[PDB]
Design a protein around this nucleic acid. Structure first.
Ligand SMILES: [Mg+2]
Ligand SMILES: [Zn+2]
Lengths: 101, 143, 67, 55, 138, 144, 81, 189, 72
RNA sequence: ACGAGACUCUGGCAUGCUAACUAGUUACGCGACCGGUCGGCGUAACUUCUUAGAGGGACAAGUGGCGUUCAGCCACCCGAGAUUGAGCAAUAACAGGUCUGUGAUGCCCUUAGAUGUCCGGGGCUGCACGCGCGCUACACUGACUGGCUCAGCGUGUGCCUACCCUACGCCGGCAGGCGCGGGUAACCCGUUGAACCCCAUUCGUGAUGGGGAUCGGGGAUUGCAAUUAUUC
């Protein structure tokens, strides 16, 4: 199938942007037409906990946070070229999922 | 304009006095078994005008209102609308009204006290029966 | 309170003493000059330094400055 | 017999059926997102997990 | 000939599509004198009342509004309509007419053209809201 | 001219459509209309005693505006504040049976039909009826 | 057969606080006096190019009453990102 | 042609107090259709003097907890009682409100002793802004407790309160409180 | 202290409702209720009846406030 | 030099850039009603609206006063904004709290009719009374009953681990029940049809239709058990 969608998830923005730019550059050096990086809304995981290990003192809370950023790339290519582009030693921490539509 | 035909300022129904100035469906609420919803359903199925006050209805209207109040299931009032559904002893669905019916059926606490159930014991001791804390609440009338 | 910290003031004084020829009375040219000749890791700090440089240029315009 | 009695009480929903995956305690447990750790263990391992303080 | 200029208040945002037409003003498909509270109807009519029907006579305006609260959707609609007329006049008529309409609108109300930046403040622990604190006892 | 639902007042449109439905005499009403409460968060029965026709008119108008609704959607439309006594108030949904019977009565008038994606929608006959009633409302005291 | 484990060396041991903490731990476990071990770890960290460092040891250092003992050198920031 | 609501002009309103002319905003830049403008008059000191007097009254009406933030209700309560002031007096309601503001503001009152003290009070003069603020507060309070536990609706209590204050009558709560404050200031002179 | 308002008119109070209320500058259910010792519901009904007969002019109507004035 | 500031996150502005069938908007076709209304259908433009990256943008910078004419303060113009809110936070100290968070712990105590551990049943709520945090009120600027119309933050099917969010259809006042689907989620719930508020209605100044404690009789739901009454 010529419809290939790459989903990129990461907790670090800089790594995700570097990987997306590298992937699109590789897909454009080859004569492939690629739909640009669609940026899904960021998911913010929140946990609020009491600071103390006990129940004593002024009630203070830690507000922890995790942020998940999601990118989508659609390209028209045979699967072999997609495999060539994907395996380019991507930056650690970025999860890449290639799906056939 | 007040009705000349002896506008009943005070009306006696079930050994209770209802006020003729009160709008119907709220005047008959004074009966100790009838409140708001029961009154409205009774008057709807008795087909009387709800905008009238209790003093402008005739004797026949009040009579049929009393009968439909005392025989709800005979006029297609649903069984879930009553306050004595599946009554213990005689498993009859009914609506208990006023002195002699509501307060006497209230005197089913003696059943609980005779079997010495925990709820009956809490009733006998004047305490609270529905599992509420008694530390810091209800301290009125307990010296 | 718009009181500048010693970081801003010493940075501005050194910048002025070193590059007085390139500077003037314009904030928007001074900030470009500062970002070209200096390494200020923040944009807000750069803007504060450029603003104080403009103030000091106006001050030297009508005489001397102790710094 | 003891075989049918030992640990025979149902443990499927209450606090007796959940515990910290680190310290095996049963109090102050965080079930959100599948962490299944108590509050103190979470404060201890939050940076390793990836939860960092921003605001 | 169209502009699509929009305006906001709190979370409510309204986009006004203004094209060459014959004086139609609708909000979410309903005519202007039908918006909900109807106590602030004059707040909606302020642009056309200030500028006159003659200036809106050559345009059709259709406003799509979504976001938080009746009283914000109002003020968002009026901001969008004012800015849409200003932009249409600037792009398709001249700078002088734009100047006069902008002067009238700004003199009457700055919020007709420039959005209010105020937003809800966060809640901090230790109190029911942004700055209120729970009762302290000794 | 030409008048639709969206260029007339919705309250008097609802009143006119309810009058039309009652006058038609083809809408089947349940036998418990004079006993039910319309919501758990209600305290009394409706005051009108013709409330079924008004509710049918409201439901038909809603299906006109945003089609594809079913029970649950209409139950959420007619939900409201529930006062829990000495407890704080909370949102509460409307009666499911009244919404289901209103929708089932609107069909059979050939004004409402099931939609493919699940739910209810207005039939072209229903759209025409609502638009004619809207034209009547507009030609009425709305503007003479 | 899918998981596998390498093992590499730290570029600069003197600049890894976990490594220095382990070194101090196993120095104290070896009977070395607290001050000698702390000062040695401090000096090794400073000689490795660190801009500054701080070693704190707390507990029953001398006697039945606990106390804390701090060794600092160079520059050390505390606030901000 | 910017009549309030859609019926009350401002061209005929005369403040005629000189002292409060700069602090009652009703006339030309402060002629608006509605007493509801969002507005940011509390951001900087003295700006509330640019707020129209009808909006100041409307804001002062939202009081005693249960009515906090309900400004649409209060603009309705002003629209009514303007419709009622016109019926009762035959004059422009804006003129009646302005006259009430003039009449109900204290001119002197007492503070704690002078430079310092903890025994008695010393008389001092009132700022025009504080005059207008206190007038609005007193008029609103008088209306509020006239309508409480009474079949007389609000927008009737407020209308009669404003009418009495415009007349200077002692049937007004605001006039009584103003006289009380002024007399106490007189005694502590 | 406790006021005792009527719920329906008597001939004396139905009088002084047909030749003085139509002369008030302001006619309101609360005003008529206080000046005729009648309940709010009766006052509203009487004012609606007077307006139906053309003796009263409606100035404004609202769910919370209805205002009438004399026909002059 | 540390702390303050700087810093990071966050709120406001960009018709400028990058670019989107898991967001749309215009336009054009095809339909449904009386040019208009279409969260009716479909496909070009494109990115204002939506997302989220880069960069820009504000500095007391401009003007006028006050100041040693300095550091700065006040006011005004232009401006999206002329003080957004948090996070982190020094030296040093407390016999502050926590051994009941820990396979963190030193010393004691106990260790087999056990202070280990399961398993029944009680308790932790028990009520003359005192004291904190609170919820609902004392109404008419309100209750009731219909009608109308607007959000945002976010959470959804699990290592063990049983337990998810729910559209639509039907049955039942109701609480619920029964079938059928979607969703591991900008894809489904959902266009989150929130409440107050708005509009109309009835009440009519009194413990009143305010207010809902207490208590009786029925019906369901979750659970292995609901009585001391889980909840509805
Ligand atoms: Mg800081
Ligand atoms: Zn743990």
């Amino acid at each position: 199938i010529h419809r290939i969608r790459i989903t990129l998830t990461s907790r670090n923005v800089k790594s995700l942007e570097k990987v997306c730019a590298d992937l699109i550059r590789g897909a454009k050096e080859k004569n492939l037409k690629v739909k640009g990086p669609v940026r899904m809304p960021t998911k913010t995981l929140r946990i609020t906990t009491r600071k103390t290990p006990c129940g004593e003192g002024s009630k203070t809370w830690d507000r922890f946070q995790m942020r998940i950023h999601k990118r989508l790339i659609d390209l028209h290519s045979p699967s072999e070229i997609v495999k060539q582009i994907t395996s380019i030693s991507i930056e650690p921490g970025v999860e890449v999922e290639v799906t056939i539509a | 304009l007040v009705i000349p035909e002896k506008f009943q300022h005070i009306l006696r129904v079930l050994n209770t006095n209802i006020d003729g100035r009160r709008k119907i469906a709220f005047a008959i609420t004074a009966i100790k078994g009838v409140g708001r919803r029961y009154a409205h359903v009774v008057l709807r199925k008795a087909d009387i005008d709800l905008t009238k006050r209790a003093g402008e209805l005739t004797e026949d209207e009040v009579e049929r209102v009393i009968t439909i109040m005392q025989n709800p299931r005979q006029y297609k009032i649903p069984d879930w609308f009553l306050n004595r559904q599946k009554d213990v002893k005689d498993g009859k669905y009914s609506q208990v009204l006023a002195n002699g019916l509501d307060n006497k059926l209230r005197e089913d606490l003696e059943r609980l006290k005779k079997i010495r159930a925990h709820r009956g014991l809490r009733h006998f001791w004047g305490l609270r029966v529905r599992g509420q804390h008694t530390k810091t609440t209800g301290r009125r009338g307990r010296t | 309170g718009r009181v500048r910290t010693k970081t801003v003031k010493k940075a501005a004084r050194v910048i002025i003493e070193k590059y007085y020829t390139r500077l003037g009375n314009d904030f928007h040219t001074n900030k470009r000059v500062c970002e070209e000749i200096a390494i200020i890791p923040s944009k807000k700090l750069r803007n504060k330094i450029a603003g104080y440089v403009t103030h000091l240029m106006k001050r030297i315009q009508r005489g001397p400055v102790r710094g | 017999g003891h075989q049918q009695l030992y640990w025979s009480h149902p443990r499927k929903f209450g606090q007796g059926s959940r515990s910290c995956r680190v310290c095996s305690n049963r109090h102050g447990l965080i079930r959100k997102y599948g962490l299944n750790m108590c509050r103190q263990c979470f404060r201890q391992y939050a940076k390793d997990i990836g939860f960092i303080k921003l605001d | 000939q169209s502009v699509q200029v929009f305006g906001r208040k709190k979370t409510a945002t309204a986009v006004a599509h203004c094209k060459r037409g014959n004086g139609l003003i609708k909000v979410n498909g309903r005519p202007l004198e039908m918006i909900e509270p109807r106590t602030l109807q004059y707040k909606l009519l302020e642009p056309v009342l200030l500028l006159g029907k003659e200036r809106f006579a050559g345009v059709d305006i259709r406003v799509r509004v979504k976001g938080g609260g009746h009283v914000a959707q109002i003020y968002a609609i009026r901001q969008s309509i004012s800015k849409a007329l200003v932009a249409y006049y600037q792009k398709y008529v001249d700078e002088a007419s734009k100047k006069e309409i902008k002067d009238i609108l700004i003199q009457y109300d700055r919020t007709l053209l420039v959005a209010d930046p105020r937003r809800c403040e966060s809640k901090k622990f230790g109190g029911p809201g942004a700055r209120a604190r729970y009762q302290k006892s000794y | 001219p030409g008048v639709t639902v969206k260029d007339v007042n919705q309250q008097e449109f609802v009143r006119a459509l309810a009058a039309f439905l009652k006058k038609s005499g083809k809408l089947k009403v349940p036998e418990w209309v004079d006993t039910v409460k319309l919501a758990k968060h209600k305290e009394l029965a409706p005051y009108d005693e013709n409330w079924f026709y008004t509710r049918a008119a409201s439901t038909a108008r809603h299906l006109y505006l945003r089609g594809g609704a079913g029970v649950g959607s209409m139950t959420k439309i007619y939900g409201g504040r529930q006062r829990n006594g000495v407890m704080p108030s909370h949102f509460s949904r409307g009666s499911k049976s009244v919404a289901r019977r209103v929708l089932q009565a609107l069909e059979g008038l050939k004004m409402v039909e099931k939609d493919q994606d699940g739910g209810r929608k207005l039939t072209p006959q229903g759209q025409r009826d609502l638009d004619r009633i809207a034209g009547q409302v507009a030609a009425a005291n709305k503007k003479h | 057969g899918s998981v596998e484990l390498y093992a590499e060396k730290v570029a600069t041991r003197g600049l890894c606080a976990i490594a220095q903490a382990e070194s101090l731990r196993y120095k104290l476990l070896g009977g070395l006096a607290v001050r000698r071990a702390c000062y040695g770890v401090l000096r090794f960290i400073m000689e490795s190019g660190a801009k500054g460092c701080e070693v704190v040891v707390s507990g029953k250092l001398r006697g039945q009453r606990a106390k804390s003992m701090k060794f600092v050198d160079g520059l050390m920031i505390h606030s901000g990102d | 042609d910017i009549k309030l609501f859609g019926k009350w002009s401002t061209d005929d309103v005369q403040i005629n107090d000189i002292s409060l002319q700069d602090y009652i905003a009703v006339k030309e830049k402060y002629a608006k259709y509605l007493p509801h403008s969002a507005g940011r008059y509390a951001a900087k000191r003295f700006r509330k003097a640019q707020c129209p007097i009808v909006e100041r009254l409307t804001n002062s009406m939202m009081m005693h907890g249960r009515n906090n933030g309900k400004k649409l209700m209060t603009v309705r309560i002003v629209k009514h009682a303007f419709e009622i002031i016109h019926l009762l007096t035959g004059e422009n309601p804006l003129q009646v409100l302005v006259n009430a503001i003039i009449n109900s503001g204290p001119r002197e009152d007492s503070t704690r002793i002078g430079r310092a003290g903890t025994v008695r009070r010393q008389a001092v003069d009132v700022s025009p802004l504080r005059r207008v603020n206190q007038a609005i507060w007193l008029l609103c309070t008088g209306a509020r407790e006239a309508a409480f536990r009474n079949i007389k609706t609000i927008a009737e209590c407020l209308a009669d309160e404003l009418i009495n204050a415009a007349k200077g009558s002692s049937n007004s709560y605001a006039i009584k409180k103003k006289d009380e404050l002024e007399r106490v200031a007189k005694s502590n002179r | 202290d406790k006021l005792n308002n009527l719920v329906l008119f008597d001939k004396a109070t139905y009088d002084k409702l047909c030749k003085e209320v139509p002369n008030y500058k302001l006619i309101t259910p609360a005003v008529v209720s206080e000046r005729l010792k009648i309940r709010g519901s009766l006052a509203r009904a009487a004012l609606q009846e007077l307006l139906s007969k053309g003796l009263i002019k409606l100035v404004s109507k609202h769910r919370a406030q209805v205002i009438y004035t004399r026909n002059t």
